[PDB]
Amino acid sequence: FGTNGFDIPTIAIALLIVGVIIGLSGLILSIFATATASAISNPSPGTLAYNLTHPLINGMVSFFSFFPTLYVLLGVTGIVLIAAGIISIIMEKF
Amino acid sequence: FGTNGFDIPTIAIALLIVGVIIGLSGLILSIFATATASAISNPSPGTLAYNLTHPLINGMVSFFSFFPTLYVLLGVTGIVLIAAGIISIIMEKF
Amino acid sequence: FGTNGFDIPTIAIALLIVGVIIGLSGLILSIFATATASAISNPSPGTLAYNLTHPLINGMVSFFSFFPTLYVLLGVTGIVLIAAGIISIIMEKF
Amino acid sequence: FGTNGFDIPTIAIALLIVGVIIGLSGLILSIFATATASAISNPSPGTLAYNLTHPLINGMVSFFSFFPTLYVLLGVTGIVLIAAGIISIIMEKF
Amino acid sequence: FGTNGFDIPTIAIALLIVGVIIGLSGLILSIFATATASAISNPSPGTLAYNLTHPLINGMVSFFSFFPTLYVLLGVTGIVLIAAGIISIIMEKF
Amino acid sequence: FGTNGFDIPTIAIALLIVGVIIGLSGLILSIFATATASAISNPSPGTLAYNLTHPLINGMVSFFSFFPTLYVLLGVTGIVLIAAGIISIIMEKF
Amino acid sequence: FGTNGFDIPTIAIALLIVGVIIGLSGLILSIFATATASAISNPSPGTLAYNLTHPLINGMVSFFSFFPTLYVLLGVTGIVLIAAGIISIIMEKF
């Protein structure tokens, strides 16, 4: 059901695959994040360990704050792909 | 249905193609613009980041304000093409 | 849909491409500018580090202030291109 | 989207590249300047070390004061390039 | 529809072409003039930059004031051409 | 639309070209003049640097004051050209 | 847009070039003059070094005082060139 490489069943299967992979990634990352949160403690505001540890958790927070826009762009990619398929169909179907 | 290169079915198909392409372009650009709007924040009116970032968004605004007249001219082009076709038909059909 | 090299679908696609590229450029530059703003500190008004660092940020500010007019000219270019296309069509379509 | 060597997407990409490179340069230079400021001390106003060290920091200050106009000229260059492109388009598009 | 080189359809097409070209010229020049107006600032009445910049804008104003009569003469030319055509027709049609 | 070398479309295009070139020249010169104004300082009224620098800025001022009449003459040239065209048309059109 | 070698666009470009070159010359000379002023000191009014150095700075002052009239003549040259162009056009355009 297509012309050259555009197949609606294949597209649906690909959507299934990406959806389930993203679900698993969220699940695993959340589960691991809980363990990390449990492991690290809060020594004191101003001792040696605080100086030694604070920037690390800051980097954690920053990278994880970067995740959402990555996911948004990844989602945007699929609309582009499907639209390219539609245009390609229309171009030489007539 | 024509004389040399003017074909009414071909013209209708071309109109279909340009219409759908313009629709897709609007869709994709709007969706991406929402993501850009979400990503960038407003630091402060007068700090370093404001000086560093404000002209960029100004350029964004300006270019996107230039878009409408581009679209208008692009639309005007088709009337010229169809009129040239009509004249060419009349010239040597009689 | 054209005469020699003027194709309305091609023009629309080109507009799409330039628009999305400009959006990405704004996004990336803003995100990076936030990081730069965070990294650099303000030592003091009159110490060695101030003398060492101030002109650099001045150059930053100046170049980024130059960006907007660059974008404006870049936008102006497209109107010229489309108008040249219209004129070329009219010249030998009749 | 151009005539011979003028490509609006290429220009936008080039602007992106120069912008990010300038941002990185500012970042790295500022970070290094902080370290230099920290390392050197102020011995005394009139001892041997002062005589030995003062002109060096004077040269530092002078060169870094030269930076801003370099950046300004570098920014001016792009407007010239884009204008040359516009003129070249207009010359033989008609 | 003519005698030797006078063709009413050709004349009408030529009028169309000159009209649209003049419209485009006005459009482009106005759009560019807005950008120029935005870019240049007003430093002060009596400093170095004022002395350096004022005559340039004076020349701008003068040349652009010369434009109108150029356009008027250009318009006058067409009446002469059409009248020459009429006379040439009458001379040897009888 | 002409007789030998006088073409109203060509004239209009030439007017467009000269107008845009003059606009760009004004823009670039003003932008550069601002940078020059910023770079040079005012040392003192009577020291060595004043003697060394004052005549240079005097020459700057003088040449830039010469610009306006150059532009005026350049503008006058076009009226002469168009009038020569009109006369040439009238001479042998009848 | 001309007759043999007189081209208004070429003239405008030449004016741009000479203007920017003169601006750069003023800039560079002023910047260098500041450095020269800083380097040389004032030993004493009547010692050996004064006798050894004074005439040199006198020659500096004199030559730099000669600059302005050079610039004025250079500016005058362009009016002559443009007028020669106008006369040449008028001579054989009719």
Short description:
Chain A has 94 residues and is mainly alpha-helical. Chain A has 2 helices and no strands. The interface between B and C is large, with 46 and 46 residues.
Structure report:
- This is part of a larger assembly, with seven copies of chain A (94 residues).
- The first copy, chain A, is mainly α and 94 residues long.
- Chain A is built from two helices and no strands.
- Chain A has helices at 8-39, 48-93.
- The interface between C and E is medium-sized, with 12 and 13 residues.
- It is classed as virus.
The number of distinct β-strands of chain A equals 0
Can you summarize the main beta sheet of chain A?
A: none
Count of helix runs of chain A:
2
Q: What are the secondary-structure elements of chain A, in order, as H or E?
A: HH
Query: Which structural class do you get from the secondary structure elements of chain A?
Result: mainly alpha
Shape of chain A: elongated
Largest interface: B-C, 46 and 46 residues
Distance between the termini of chain A: 16 Å
Oligomer: part of a larger assembly
**Which percent band covers the strand fraction of chain A?**
under 5%
What is the CA-based Rg of chain A, rounded? 22 Å
- Helical content of chain A (DSSP H or I, runs of 4+): over 70%
PDB class: virus
Keywords: helical symmetry, archaeal virus, lemon-shaped virus, spindle-shaped virus, virus
Entry title: Cryo-EM reconstruction of Sulfolobus monocaudavirus SMV1, symmetry 10
Chains A and 6 copies: major capsid protein
